[PDB]
Amino acid sequence: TRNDVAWYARYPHILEEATRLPFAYPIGQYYDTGYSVASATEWSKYVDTSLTIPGVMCVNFTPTPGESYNKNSPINIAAQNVYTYVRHMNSGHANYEQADLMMYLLAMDSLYIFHSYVRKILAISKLYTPVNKYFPRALLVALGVDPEDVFANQAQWEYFVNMVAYRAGAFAAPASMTYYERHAWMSNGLYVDQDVTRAQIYMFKPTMLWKYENLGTTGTKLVPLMMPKAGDNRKLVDFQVLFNNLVSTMLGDEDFGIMSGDVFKAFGADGLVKLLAVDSTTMTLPTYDPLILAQIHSARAVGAPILETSTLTGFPGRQWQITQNPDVNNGAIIFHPSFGYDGQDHEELSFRAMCSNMILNLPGEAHSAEMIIEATRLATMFQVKAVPAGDTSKPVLYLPNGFGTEVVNDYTMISVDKATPHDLTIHTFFNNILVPNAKENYVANLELLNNIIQFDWAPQLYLTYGIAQESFGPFAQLNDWTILTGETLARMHEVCVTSMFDVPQMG
């Protein structure tokens, strides 16, 4: 009745010596697995020995005030609310209306996103990890900066970002208006997909920002100013002329000073948005945030911003514009962009796969209301098709059913090349990926898919093929999913646009 000792405890040294393997391979590095048969070099591409692991997926976003068609919009009701808060705290006759104050209050958001963007470029460059070779150059390439310009001209970069914080910090914006705090939370922060040391990184970069473009008696028109994309090796002179183009109409201007001083008198100095200062010791560390990951997982990309120089055959006058005119819609702030654009004046046939009802996927089984409504923020569903003009139209445009305080334009992923010299590879994609009929892009699409599934809460993919004439649905792993129709997402969007632009109590 005596249990004898097992084999593994009778020879523990044999077990511990056979199983001593080197784990924790550094990412940012090409790995060749080698051959197990070694005669298989006669089977050249039929044997895959490469092992590339990506590190950065940058979510490329556009900040939005929400959808707006009339004065009953939540941005216009918020303009009314904040204007009667500011006007009833400032003694005197104002010269600006409610729409001028809300357009100022959105231009200040674009300034603060610019400051967080250049401060992110600065604070990324000091990150080092031996087991992550993507730090810091892949993060800098994903933000569209030349990485050597930041190391060579470090003091000039610090002066530029501190001067942006000084010159944009001269304007006042309410701190208890969570739009600024949310956009700062997105633009300041590196997010791991998993709480490990060799984790993949998510970032948020603006695709464009809103430039003020004063018009006079015919109103106010926030225009797009495009940010540099990943792969552009932009230096400090390019970010300087971008900052100078963003502030050329409001830096030494009297109306912006009057509106800023009125916001500074209405909300106290403790009630203003504070810009972070940057020294040579400022570092942002990658943090684990499941709310970030939840809204990245349910993000749906809407496509490229339509510009005034963008050529669209059957769609004239569809450029993205936050407008204001007393002649149109009784002086309401108007913003209703059409989606499904990518440049390239033709139909991107893959956006037809975005016409299904989305799947909102969460982990676990108990979901609070705050988690559910935070996971739907980057989600945008199409509702109808935009109507062309001329009976000859190459692209296909879509109107949404509302959207949050930001929309996703793109995702950019940074991995290592499997070919020598194993430099960084840059892949830009929507949720919808078209795979045309050529022998080159099948293995390339499979490499993009295997790269994407390394990211723990990656956005759900939709893949269409050329010869198949067929889209495949959500390429993602689901745990506890529900199906969202456009009306539920529209209600959540209206609630969250109202909550971001909310002012405190007094009058």
CA 57 – CA 458 distance, rounded (Å): 9
**Does 84 sit near a second copy (CB under 8 A)?**
yes
HSE toward the beta carbon, residue 302, CA cutoff 13 A: 28
In angstroms, give the least distance from the CB of 171 to a second copy. Answer: 22
Provide the residue type at 228 as one letter: P
From the list 158, 181, 213, 253, which residue makes contact with a second copy (rule: CB under 8 A)? 253
| Upstream peptide bond of 136 is cis (omega within 30 degrees of 0) | yes
In angstroms, give the least distance from the CB of 441 to a second copy. Answer: 46
Q: Is 423 exposed, middle or buried (0-12, 13-18, 19+ CB in 10 A)?
A: exposed
From the list 4, 17, 42, 254, which residue makes contact with a second copy (rule: CB under 8 A)? 254
Binding mask 97-126 for a second copy (x = CB under 8 A): xxx---------------------------
Q: Are 386 and 315 in contact (CB under 8 A)?
A: yes
From the list 67, 109, 193, 262, which residue makes contact with a second copy (rule: CB under 8 A)? 262
**Does 83 sit near a second copy (CB under 8 A)?**
yes
In angstroms, give the least distance from the CB of 83 to a second copy. Answer: 6
Secondary structure class of 481 (helix, strand, coil): strand
| Upstream peptide bond of 421 is cis (omega within 30 degrees of 0) | yes
* Distance set, CA 378 to CA 6, 225, 301, 484 (Å): 56, 21, 8, 14
Binding mask 222-251 for a second copy (x = CB under 8 A): ----------------------x--xxx-x
CA 473 – CA 363 distance, rounded (Å): 20
From the list 5, 21, 24, 269, which residue makes contact with a second copy (rule: CB under 8 A)? 269
In angstroms, give the least distance from the CB of 498 to a second copy. Answer: 12
* Distance set, CA 234 to CA 247, 340, 376 (Å): 19, 27, 33
In angstroms, give the least distance from the CB of 62 to a second copy. Answer: 22
In angstroms, give the least distance from the CB of 65 to a second copy. Answer: 12
**Does 85 sit near a second copy (CB under 8 A)?**
yes
Count of all residues that appear for the chain in the document: 507
Nearer to a second copy, 243 or 430 (CB): 243
From the list 62, 64, 110, 260, which residue makes contact with a second copy (rule: CB under 8 A)? 260
From the list 61, 160, 256, 339, which residue makes contact with a second copy (rule: CB under 8 A)? 256
Give the single-character DSSP code of 172. Answer: -
Provide the residue type at 306 as one letter: I
Per-residue HEC secondary structure of 410-428 comes to EEEEEEECCCCCCCEEEEE
From the list 231, 257, 290, 363, which residue makes contact with a second copy (rule: CB under 8 A)? 257
In angstroms, give the least distance from the CB of 77 to a second copy. Answer: 5
- Which region, judged by CB under 8 A, interacts with a second copy, from 54-62, 128-136, 313-321, 328-336? 328-336
B/e letters for 14-29, b = 16+ CB within 10 Å, e = fewer, are eeeeeeeeeeeeebbe
* Distance set, CA 120 to CA 176, 277, 286, 292, 410 (Å): 23, 11, 12, 17, 19
CA 292 – CA 185 distance, rounded (Å): 9
CA 351 – CA 445 distance, rounded (Å): 17
In 134-206, beta strands by DSSP E: 190-192, 201-206
**Does 507 sit near a second copy (CB under 8 A)?**
yes
From the list 265, 336, 418, 422, which residue makes contact with a second copy (rule: CB under 8 A)? 265
From the list 95, 218, 330, 450, which residue makes contact with a second copy (rule: CB under 8 A)? 330
Binding mask 42-81 for a second copy (x = CB under 8 A): ----------------------------xxxxxxxxxxxx
In angstroms, give the least distance from the CB of 326 to a second copy. Answer: 10
From the list 185, 231, 235, 258, which residue makes contact with a second copy (rule: CB under 8 A)? 258
From the list 105, 332, 375, 434, which residue makes contact with a second copy (rule: CB under 8 A)? 332
In angstroms, give the least distance from the CB of 497 to a second copy. Answer: 12
Residues touching a second copy: how many (CB under 8 A)?
A: 45
* Distance set, CA 15 to CA 11, 348, 375 (Å): 7, 57, 46
Instruction: Return residues touching a second copy (CB under 8 A).
Output: 70-81, 83-85, 87-88, 97-99, 244, 247-249, 251-254, 256-258, 260-265, 269, 330-333, 505-507
